Amino acid sequence: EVETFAFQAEIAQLMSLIINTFYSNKEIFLRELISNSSDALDKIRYESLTDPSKLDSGKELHINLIPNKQDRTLTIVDTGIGMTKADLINNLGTIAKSGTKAFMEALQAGADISMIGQFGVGFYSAYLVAEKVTVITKHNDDEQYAWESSAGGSFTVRTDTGEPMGRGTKVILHLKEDQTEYLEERRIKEIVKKHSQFIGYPITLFVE
């Protein structure tokens, strides 16, 4: 039903660093997630030029941002390529076992956290604002799975019993209690407009 996995030691230490380093510019997390999405839509757009048959589970290639004050969550939803269970398990828990060592040296040599996307591990910035992250993903190959983690060394994968969802990936941030500014419409618009104004796909910010 629920499988529990250990972060590979580097990823866990990176996560630790991200959660523990005092660092005020937290808002860069959104750009990292919006940018993961765009890649994933690129990558599905790519494969449907040799099989316009993969858009059968979707076609509309977009990114939604969904704030919810009462659950204190901000969700970044994309209809991109999605991940299989092994994608999910490898490229969240291992996979850039590499891009992570690079980053953590880079951090000496006055690199600062805001340049995390350059090493392919931007996703982990979500931990600047969230006590818990849930990733709901559905790939053309496979079932629909829920990945989950509040850090602390491990994560879980279970098959998703929730809203079936076409194809793509939903990242749900359960916000830290003092980062509820990222739930707010003007706060979000300012950040999108500042860091992601030229993304190739529509980004719809929902209202509550």
Ligand X SMILES: CCNC(=O)c1cc2c(-c3ccc(Cl)cc3Cl)nc(N)nc2s1
Helix/strand/coil (H/E/C) assignment for every residue in the chain? CEEEEECCHHHHHHHHHHHHCCCCCCCHHHHHHHHHHHHHHHHHHHHCCCCCCHHHHCCCCCEEEEEECCCCEEEEEECCCCCCHHHHHHHHHCCCCCHHHHHHHHCCCCCCHHHHHHHCCHHHHHHHHEEEEEEEEECCCCCEEEEEECCCCEEEEEECCCCCCCCEEEEEEEECCCCHHHHCHHHHHHHHHHHCCCCCCCEEECCC
- Per-residue contact flags (x/-) with ligand X for residues 128 to 157, judged by CB under 6 A: -------x----------------------
Q: Is 188 in the site for ligand X (CB under 6 A)?
A: no
Which CB, 28 or 40, lies closer to ligand X? 40
Residue 37 makes contact with ligand X by CB under 6 A:
yes
Residue 3 beta carbon to ligand X: minimum distance, rounded to whole angstroms: 17
Identify the residue among 74, 92, 116, 128 touching ligand X (CB under 6 A).
Answer: 92
Q: Binding of ligand X at residue 169 (CB under 6 A)?
A: yes
97 is in an annotated binding site: yes
> Is residue 87 a contact residue for ligand X (CB under 6 A)?
yes
Told to check if 36 binds ligand X by CB under 6 A, we report: yes
Closest to ligand X by CB, 39 vs 69, is: 39
Chain positions contacting ligand X, by CB under 6 A: 36-37, 40, 78, 80-81, 83, 87, 91-92, 121, 123, 135, 169, 171
Annotated binding site for ATP: 36, 78, 97, 123
